[PDB]
Design a protein around this ligand. Structure first.
Ligand SMILES: N[C@H](C(=O)O)[C@@H]1CC[C@@H]1C(=O)O
Ligand SMILES: N[C@H](C(=O)O)[C@@H]1CC[C@@H]1C(=O)O
Ligand SMILES: [Cl-]
Ligand SMILES: [Cl-]
Ligand SMILES: [Cl-]
Lengths: 260, 263
């Protein structure tokens, strides 16, 4: 429909999740989460109607070295399939070069998730040993962070990870978490702190974040390069942050019921 | 002894019991809304008890396994002493009445047919006489048991096709039935209770409809363990709410007042 903004997003708790009973629901009402609420807020402030669509290949966005084709939500923006991406999408240099980003709406860093009791306290710890395997999501800013790093500990970790057998890489966050939970403390998962903290507060309460974050960065709302929508969306993010509304949303979707 | 909090077993089935929008930050009864949620509040008020709403663990209404003879679902919760009362769209049936107490019905209904708009079917007879349009029911519950037990030729004929169709024509939840009708381009019809049918008919994208008359006539009742002293009070409360017109007000509130398909 004319004037309808196509929003690309991704299923990632608690950002975007299928509602209970979603099978009888339709359109935007199928989904719930932090980014679903944020999308509604941004839309309201900028005065547009929008349609949420889950990205086809289920990926965030990387560029194939061979074909130099972008995939994921980044791909959707770059090739004109979506008008805006509203998701836990990390602002990185290589992405900033091909799409526009708002100022960040949330902060985060790469962190370590272990099964409770695992004798690891830091990235350094992981790097100095081999009994406990560790990996990341097979595509995204986290894996790219280790692949590009010239920092000693991270470089070591990467040279280990890219070769380890069987693969320490997983296809989804849920899959990474599952692997931590099944491996009796022999697998540690490298993921962004926001997801780590969410999962930490959920049953069966057998995982935990250890150490400080390995880096500091932010999620931004992304639009195609030079899109006129960019300006309004950026001012809207800043406005919502200043009203304390971004904080309210974090507190709502990371609200601790006491499962753990 | 002293008064205890009443444990209410119920089930997530729209618009009887639904998650409230901000459920993620709410606790206890406050997480839920809908017809049965309001009904529980009214019943508790007139009866003078405090209560806790609990969603049934296995997500079933109640059936007895032929093998083990164990009751599952909300009926099971009551039978095995896990809950004190069930407040849900629970169909009053012979096999259940044998093992639990039921109030007089708070709502009437009948098994019905839901089609995607434009499907060339207007009756169960129509369905039975063709094969192009598949049809099914929820894989457990009073609707499936109706066909499985029917001695009436048309329904026996529908059951004979349904039990052996492939892929399976049964669905696990009402939502799954609705999705199957909506996505199958007129090649799937869903057999469900007229109450759910009339509700979905008023929801976006307004692409379904109830066709034909009802296949039977029955009621939903409040259930309690057999012999429970709570039964008497709750029954009278249901009768009172009906005669005051409160039950009619509630159905209009949840079915029609905020229907999404026009006026
Ligand atoms: N924010 C990341 C991204 O933009 O690529 C996502 C979250 C999983 C994935 C990752 O951590 O690599
Ligand atoms: N009222 C029914 C019951 O008590 O079993 C429920 C509603 C879905 C299921 C059905 O239609 O069979
Ligand atoms: Cl669901
Ligand atoms: Cl108590
Ligand atoms: Cl009625």
């Amino acid at each position: 429909a004319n004037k309808t903004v196509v929003v690309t997003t991704i299923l990632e708790s608690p950002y975007v999740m299928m509602k209970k009973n979603h099978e009888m629901l339709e359109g935007n009402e199928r989904y719930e989460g932090y980014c679903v609420d944020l999308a509604a807020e941004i839309a309201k402030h900028c005065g547009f109607k929008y349609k949420l669509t889950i990205v086809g290949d289920g990926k965030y966005g990387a560029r194939d070295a061979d074909t130099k084709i972008w995939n994921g939500m980044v791909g959707e923006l770059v090739y004109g399939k979506a008008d805006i991406a509203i998701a836990p999408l990390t602002i990185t240099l290589v992405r900033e070069e091909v799409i526009d980003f708002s100022k960040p709406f949330m902060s985060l860093g790469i962190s370590i998730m272990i099964k409770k009791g695992t004798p690891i306290e830091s990235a350094e710890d992981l790097s100095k040993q081999t009994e406990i395997a560790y990996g990341t999501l097979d595509s995204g800013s986290t894996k790219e962070f280790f692949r590009r790093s010239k920092i000693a500990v991270f470089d070591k970790m990467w040279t280990y990870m890219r070769s380890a057998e069987p693969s320490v890489f997983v296809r989804t966050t849920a899959e990474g978490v599952a692997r931590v939970r099944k491996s009796k403390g022999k697998y540690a998962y490298l993921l962004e702190s926001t997801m780590n903290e969410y999962i930490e507060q959920r049953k069966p309460c057998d995982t935990m974040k250890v150490g400080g974050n390995l880096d500091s960065k932010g999620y931004g709302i992304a639009t195609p390069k030079g899109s006129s929508l960019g300006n309004a969306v950026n001012l809207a993010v800043l406005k919502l942050n200043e009203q304390g509304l971004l904080d309210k949303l974090k507190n709502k979707w990371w609200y601790d019921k006491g499962e753990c």
